[PDB]
Amino acid sequence: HTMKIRSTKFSILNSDHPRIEVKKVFSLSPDVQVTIPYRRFKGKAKVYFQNDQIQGYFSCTDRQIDEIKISAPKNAPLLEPLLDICYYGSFIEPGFEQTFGFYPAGKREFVDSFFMHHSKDHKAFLIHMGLDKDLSLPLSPELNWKEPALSKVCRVTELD
């Protein structure tokens, strides 16, 4: 049932369809290509996640996150599990349909690149969700839980 990405555990609570594999082909030249498959959702899904003392669920439609609900310690840095969620759904680029600015050799490399790149700069997550003027929302743009800021990550709230 359960899957793991790095230290984050995932359990699908419900979903329209089983997860699908996309076999993405990158062309290096007319007669040389690299195929790097990735998994994603077709239609709707609601998925539980857990990483040590952080947990919650997200809802998505295809490759768009619709909401995330979280329980975590005050001031917890949520970058790591949030990138694990992003990987699990193929929610942000680069790393799925887009390369990191050079041709990838295969999946192992492409996964390592994803976590290096987006850990150094996670702006793709902020762009995916959007930023909100509603300062009552819990997630700061640096992805720290309940940190004050002049904007907050859209559609990320505390668990009921």
Author numbering: 326 to 485
From the paper:
A construct comprising residues 323–486 could be expressed, crystallised in two different forms, and its structure determined at 1.8 Å resolution. Firstly, the so called ‘348-loop’ formed by the β3–β4 hairpin is longer in THOV and its extremity orientates away from the body of the domain towards the solvent, whereas in IAV the tip packs against bends the body of the molecule. Secondly, the prominent, solvent exposed ‘424-loop’ of the IAV cap-binding domain is absent due to truncation in THOV. Finally, in all three crystallographically independent examples of the THOV domain, the equivalent position of the m7G itself is occupied by the side-chain of Arg344, with its guanidinium group stacking with the side-chain and making two hydrogen bonds to the main-chain carbonyl oxygen of Tyr413. The THOV domain is not retained by m7G Sepharose under conditions where IAV cap-binding domain is and, similarly, no binding of m7GTP could be detected by isothermal calorimetry experiments under conditions where IAV cap-binding domain shows clear binding with a Kd of 2.7 µM.
In this paper we present the atomic structures of the putative PB2 cap binding and 627 domains of THOV and the putative PA N-terminal endonuclease domains of THOV and DHOV. Despite very low sequence homologies, all domains have similar folds to those of the corresponding IAV polymerase domains.
